[PDB]
Amino acid sequence: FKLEAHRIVSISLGKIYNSRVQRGGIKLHKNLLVSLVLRSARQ
Amino acid sequence: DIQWCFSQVKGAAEADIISTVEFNHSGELLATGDKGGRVVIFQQEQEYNVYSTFQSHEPEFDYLKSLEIEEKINKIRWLPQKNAAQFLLSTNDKTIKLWKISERDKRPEGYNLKEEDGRYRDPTTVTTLRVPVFRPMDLMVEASPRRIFANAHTYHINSISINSDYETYLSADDLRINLWHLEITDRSFNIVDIKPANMEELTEVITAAEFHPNSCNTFVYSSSKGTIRLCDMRASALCDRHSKLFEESNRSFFSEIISSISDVKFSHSGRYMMTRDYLSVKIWDLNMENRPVETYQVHEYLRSKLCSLYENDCIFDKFECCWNGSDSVVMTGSYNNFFRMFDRNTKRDITLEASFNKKILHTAWHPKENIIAVATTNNLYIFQD
Amino acid sequence: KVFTKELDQWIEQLNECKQLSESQVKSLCEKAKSNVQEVRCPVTVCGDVHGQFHDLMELFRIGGKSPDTNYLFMGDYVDRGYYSVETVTLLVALKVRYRERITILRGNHESRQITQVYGFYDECLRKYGNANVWKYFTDLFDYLPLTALVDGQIFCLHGGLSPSIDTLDHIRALDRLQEVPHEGPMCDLLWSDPDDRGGWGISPRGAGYTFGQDISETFNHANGLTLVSRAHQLVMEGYNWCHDRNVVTIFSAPNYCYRCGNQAAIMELDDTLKYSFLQFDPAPRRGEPHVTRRTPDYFL
Amino acid sequence: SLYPIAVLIDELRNEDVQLRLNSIKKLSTIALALGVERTRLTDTIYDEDEVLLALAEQLGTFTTLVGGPEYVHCLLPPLESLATVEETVVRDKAVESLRAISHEHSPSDLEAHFVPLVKRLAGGDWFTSRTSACGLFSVCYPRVSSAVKAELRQYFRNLCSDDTPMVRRAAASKLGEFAKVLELDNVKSEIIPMFSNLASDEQDSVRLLAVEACVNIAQLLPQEDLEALVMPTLRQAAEDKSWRVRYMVADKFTELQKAVGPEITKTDLVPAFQNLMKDCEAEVRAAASHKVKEFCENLSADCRENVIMSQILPCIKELVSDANQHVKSALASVIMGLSPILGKDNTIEHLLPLFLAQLKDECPEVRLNIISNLDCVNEVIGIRQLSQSLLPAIVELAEDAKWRVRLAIIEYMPLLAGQLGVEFFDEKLNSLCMAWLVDHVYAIREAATSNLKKLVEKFGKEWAHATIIPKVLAMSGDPNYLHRMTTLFCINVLSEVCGQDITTKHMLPTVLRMAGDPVANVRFNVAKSLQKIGPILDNSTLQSEVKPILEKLTQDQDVDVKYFAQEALTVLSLA
Ligand SMILES: [Fe+3]
Ligand SMILES: [Zn+2]
């Protein structure tokens, strides 16, 4: 396997923090969807 | 198959984004929501045209949390025609407003009675004006707000819907559902509260809800996991003891986002229910829950690309669907400004182009004729058959 | 002394959550115009109230009615409540009515330009509609004490320590009448906050300075004080201790933002100078009840 | 001048609701001066909630000022315009107005315009029109020709059969009083069919309204025939699928029982009542429990006892132990109310265990509600059988972290003291009164002080002098100035009831001592205290002690002390 998915865990956090600046703050739907996509620490 | 005819475009960059489209129960008047509070209303020419406009909401800055709440009318719903004046429920992210759109009834009366500024007395201030101001007869439709609902939704509002018995209407935010009486706007009955005490464990988001069209007690609310729960207020006052749960190899990272159902609508007959998840339109007979009666695919090629759409914002798009008045057919939007009609009779699907890049998020279907209305982002289309 | 009995009637009027006329508030404000406000031993100290007028009525119910009960308020009464103007009027009314039994301390939220950048001007436009009411409400800020040095033993203010102000003698040299941009000790002394880490720090807010146990020991032993009472930020359980009884924070707005479950408190100071925090819950006000699991009468 | 206000209503345009309303609400002189002929009333048609409501409020009075018996039909098109509005409250007032003028219309006008107006409203497809008509039929029917009496029932049936649910809601709502004047055989033959349709309607809001209709229908028809005519519909309503209908049947249950008589109650309502108390919805148990007292008191005395112990009271056992706070609180409010029926034996057997169970609930509201109604039990068995189990609940309530619970119990101490009596209250609760006086929350200190006043009123002078006054004065010694101030408020309220002798001789000296208190708060509260008690004080002692001490305070360094001391002397006329 080569790095095609590690992007996703970082983007999971990157979109959580990028929401707080925009109009209306957090949208709990989009925030939970962004937060549920992740990556296992070890295999 | 239905030979849909290309719509005439009558309406039409950030405030003008049609966040909802809705025909009245007898579909003569069409009201479209917006992201700028301007509910542009059209009505069918008596054998559609720009009828009126009203600023349903202003940018209500919350001073307790400093949240710059937008004027985003996420739902437009009509009421039954109580009198000659039509009514519309408009809901922004935080609060609902009931509106009255009445014609100018006193047009003749205003012309039939007039005197001088001092009621026909001498030395009137505006002596000429009174001679001409007496001609006030006009055919314009006058918008007016009737009742203001309270600030009940602590979260972004996603759905409202008039009940079958015209005393109450549903309101659901991403965590809770409140039932609002139409005239009594000072209080609401919180009928559903899925909220976990600690927000740490937030798994379920109520993405959409509606009332059963013929039964005043049956309503459904979607979920982030796709499990559509059909609640029945007959069982108990609080509807946490739901009556049914509808739920269905490809278990990618994003299984938790594809399973989210952005929209749920009952058939006009209330015999079937159609739920739009991200990838598929699932049509359920209300008596069988372990699988739909028919599953429909909205876009095939997008199932594998769940990272690319997740780098982008596109994968969060809220799609919606609507039925034929006869329920024989259903229709939903797809990306690239394309929407698809899923005929349940012949199982033949025809995609249609409105005239990724552009999303047909919201659309509507006239409940008495093969007329469908489409909420393109910066355009509105009303396709005929 | 007819105007005095009229203001005694304004007490009743204000308690009904009704705002005074511009003429009434101006006649009061004109008659309203230090850093060492030596407060005698029996006094009640209150934290943020932030315009929660019903919660302020509750607060008076908990602490007590003035002039009977003395008061000294660390300042936050405008930006965060539905009844900003109705709170500020009651406060300054108490002050001018009882100049020696009520004290109001300059807060961190109270300015002219940033409040205009914020909404409070819009709030006053909704309430009154004009600039004069807001202006009259702002000029009292310059004449409001910066700190409350209760005695040689206990010290209290809205903020906390600063890089430039170690000794009480320095507190004396501070000027109350100063509206100048955000930079300088004028912000530090109001917007400061403590933390368990010992050293300087900065935050995403306007300029405000933090401090730890080391700075608290410098400020205390160099002054013979016993606390640095604060009310700057939100604290759950109503009062937050720090640095082993060297810094303490009071919040007096129960359920600060209606979303939050935070308790609130106020500290009574006895004759024998001793802090006694009082715990109280948010008022029984239902407002618009949306939570009520007792089905509303329209559905029954 | 003052007379043209009749026409300024719309002479001003782009009006203000306040100006329009004030221009509109001036009826006395204009109705006789201008409205007789100039109105021929299209100025009376403005479309807004408050103005429409005001129009209705005023149009209801034109009958006596305009020559009603001849022309009153001229008032109908205005009231028609008001009745067809969307606003429900406006429609209600418009219909009340039409109902008022109905009593003054002559049968000729009633027949010529009034009945055809009702017909036109039914004919008007805007369902608010139909909605309005539902309430008008009830007053025109008694005096109109038998032909019209028959024709009206056809449209009324059409109303009950209309496919607009709101119409059926209104129709069902007004059917109750309508049946009161319809011919008895016509009620049986013509109303019962449509009533059955209403009570079985698809929409639950419609079905839930049929039960008050059933109440009135049962009040009218002979009791002997209700078992066949109405009761089959009531059975299926009381056991309806929706908890809302069950709630309403439980709520209207007292009226139902009164209407259908006790024999049918014993035969059909009691089992239904059990099925309501056991319902899976907390709200239905709440409604049913609320009415259990009245229902039992309304049953025939022969069956009431045995019916309770056999069918209801065993269900009460489950209600007292219910999982829902609201259900336990609701039953708790009334449950003692069964005591007059079950007082001698049954109260000890079942009701006392039920009380003691409720007196230990986690929620304070349950315990508060039980202690709020103890009268029902104290008059039959006496408080001694309860006191031993009342004392821990009131003690626990009086110490809740939520001070509002302590306040809530303080409000009931005089009722409690009157019930528990002189010995028990001063043995066990007086200490709790003092516990509230010293309490850290001012709201508690204040409420407890004013409460203590009521206790002195209930007990009189010598009791308070012997036991209470010696303690309240001891709070003067407290280093906490708030407790001294509470002594001043206590002294203040006590002076009114304990009188001039006890106040000036035993109690008053304590106020002078703290007049020189080092805290200005205690000093000026001494001023305010003498200012309030002063009129009760003797002129000799007032001049000897009150005057020179008040005068001393008028020269203090504190402007507040000087202000209040001067104000006191002024009010006392001493200086
Ligand atoms: Fe603060
Ligand atoms: Zn602050």
Q: Does B259 touch chain D (CB under 8 A)?
A: no
Domain that holds residue D513: 492-575
Are D481 and C42 an interchain contact pair (Cβ–Cβ within 8 Å)?
A: yes
Alpha helices (H) in chain B, listed in sequence order: 107-112, 127-133, 255-258, 308-311
Are D86 and B87 an interchain contact pair (Cβ–Cβ within 8 Å)?
A: yes
Helix/strand/coil (H/E/C) assignment for every residue in chain C: CHHHHHHHHHHHHHHCCCCCCHHHHHHHHHCCCCCCCCCCCCEEEECECCCCHHHHHHHHHHHCCCCCCCEEEEECCCCCCCCHHHHHHHHHHHHHHCCCCEEEEEECCCCCHHHHHCCHHHHHHHHCCCHHHHHHHHHCCCCCCCEECCCCCCEEECCCCCCCCCCHHHHHHCCCCCCCCCCCHHHHHHHCEECCCCCCCCCCCCCCCEECHHHHHHHHHCCCCCCEEECCCCCCCEEEEECCCCEEEEECCCCCCCCCCCCEEEEEECCCCCEEEEEECCCCCCCCCCCCCCCCCCCC
Q: Can you tell me whether residue B131 is helix, strand or coil?
A: helix
User: Best of D251, D284, D410, D441 to disrupt the C interface by mutation (most C CBs within 10 Å)?
Assistant: D441
Provide, as residue numbers in chain A, all residues whose Cβ is less than 8 Å from the Cβ of B253: 5, 8, 37-39
Q: Does C122 touch chain B (CB under 8 A)?
A: yes
Backbone torsions φ then ψ of B28, nearest 5 degrees? -110, -45
Are A5 and B174 an interchain contact pair (Cβ–Cβ within 8 Å)?
A: no
Which residues between 95 and 124 in chain B have a beta carbon less than 8 angstroms from any beta carbon of chain D?
Answer: 100, 102, 105-106, 109-110, 112-121
Are C68 and D480 an interchain contact pair (Cβ–Cβ within 8 Å)?
A: no
d(CA C79, CA C138): 13
Residue at D96 is within a domain? no
- Which residue type, as a one-letter code, is found at position C179? E
- Taking the CA of residue C198 and the nearest CA in chain D, the distance in Å comes to 36
d(CA C28, CA C87): 14
What end-to-end distance do the CA atoms of chain C give, in Å?
Answer: 56
Which experimental approach was used here? cryo-EM
Q: In sequence order, what E strands does D320-369 have?
A: none
Q: Does C153 touch chain D (CB under 8 A)?
A: no
Provide, as residue numbers in chain B, all residues whose Cβ is less than 8 Å from the Cβ of A8: 253, 307, 310
After which residue numbers is chain D interrupted with C–N beyond 2.5 angstroms? 40
- Which residue type, as a one-letter code, is found at position B40? V
Q: List the domain boundaries for chain A.
A: 6-36
User: Best of B71, B74, B174 to disrupt the A interface by mutation (most A CBs within 10 Å)?
Assistant: B174
Closest CA to B189 of B168, B209, B161: B168
Length of chain D measured in residues: 575
CATH number of domain containing D569: 1.25.10.10
- Displacement of CA B232 from its chain's centroid (Å): 22
- Taking the CA of residue A18 and the nearest CA in chain B, the distance in Å comes to 12
Nearest ligand by distance to the CA of C105: 1
d(CA B179, CA B185): 10
Binding site residue list of C for Zn(2+): 48, 50, 76
Q: Does C294 touch chain B (CB under 8 A)?
A: no
Residues with CB under 5 A from ligand 2 (ion): C 76, 108, 232
Are D126 and B81 an interchain contact pair (Cβ–Cβ within 8 Å)?
A: yes
Helix/strand/coil (H/E/C) assignment for every residue in D462-484: HHHHHHHHHHHHHHHHCCCHHHH
Q: Which chains touch C (3 or more CB pairs under 8 A)?
A: B, D
d(CA D268, CA D185): 25
Q: Does D30 touch chain B (CB under 8 A)?
A: no
Length of chain C measured in residues: 300
- Per the CB < 8 A criterion, the answer to whether D26 and D56 are in contact is no
Question: Domains in chain B, start-ordered, CATH in brackets?
Answer: 21-86+149-383 (2.130.10.10)
Chain D: which residues have CB within 8 Å of chain C? 244, 247-248, 251, 283, 286-287, 326, 401-404, 440-443, 445-446, 479-482, 485, 518-521, 524-525, 558-560, 563
Q: List the domain boundaries for chain C.
A: 20-109+142-280
Q: Nearest-CA residue of chain C relative to B217? A: C299
d(CA D515, CA D561): 10
Q: Does C293 touch chain B (CB under 8 A)?
A: yes
The structure tokens listed for D365 are 């509201």
Q: Helix crossing, D88-102 with D49-59: angle to 10°?
A: 10
Per the annotation, the verdict on C109 as an active-site residue is yes
The domain made up of C20-109+142-280 has a fold known as: Purple Acid Phosphatase; chain A, domain 2 (3.60.21)
Q: Does A13 touch chain B (CB under 8 A)?
A: no
Q: Can you tell me whether residue B124 is helix, strand or coil?
A: coil
Q: Are strands C193-194 and C210-211 parallel, antiparallel or unpaired?
A: parallel
Rounded distance from Cα C13 to ligand 2 centre (Å): 28
Q: Does D11 touch chain B (CB under 8 A)?
A: yes
Are B106 and D47 an interchain contact pair (Cβ–Cβ within 8 Å)?
A: yes
For residue D199, the tally of other CB atoms under 10 A from its CB is: 24
**Which of B203, B205, B253 faces A29 most closely, judged by CB atoms?**
B205
What's the total number of domains in chain D? 1
